[PDB]
């Protein structure tokens, strides 16, 4: 039971950032709305794969920036019941 259930965004790959930014943008505009996990994640999965390296690298680059920000807080983060 490592847990750490209060981590930052994460070091997630560009793949998850693709879902992340899209699912969030919709949720920011519509605080009344959510999404369907199986639906949205599948749509993103297929759509991501079919995109170009330019677009994928864009999400990758953003992930690099969040990864470093994560590392910064990671040092100051104490694992709650972190076995």
């Amino acid at each position: 039971g490592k847990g750490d259930p209060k981590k930052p965004r994460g070091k997630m790959s560009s793949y998850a950032f693709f879902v992340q930014t899209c699912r969030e943008e919709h949720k920011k505009k519509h605080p009344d709305a959510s999404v369907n996990f199986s639906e949205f994640s599948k749509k993103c999965s297929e759509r991501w794969k079919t995109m170009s390296a330019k677009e994928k690298g864009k999400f990758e680059d953003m992930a690099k920036a969040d990864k470093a920000r994560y590392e910064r807080e990671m040092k100051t983060y104490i694992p709650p019941k972190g076995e």
């Binding site: 259930p5 209060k6 981590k7 965004r9 994460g10 997630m12 790959s13 793949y15 998850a16 693709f18 879902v19 992340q20 699912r23 969030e24 949720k27 605080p31 959510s34 999404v35 996990f37 199986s38 639906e39 949205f40 994640s41 599948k42 993103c44 999965s45």
Partner: protein
Amino acid sequence: LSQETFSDLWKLLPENNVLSPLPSQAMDDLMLSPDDIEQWFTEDPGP
């Protein structure tokens, strides 16, 4: 081994080079896995 090209032949499969654990139980756990994401992925009062 003596297989320089032979061990590469089968890697024409759809892979990312296989450096990531791929969820086999659900495709909705592919990108944003619930354990961490639920803090920000969705903001609900309760199930």
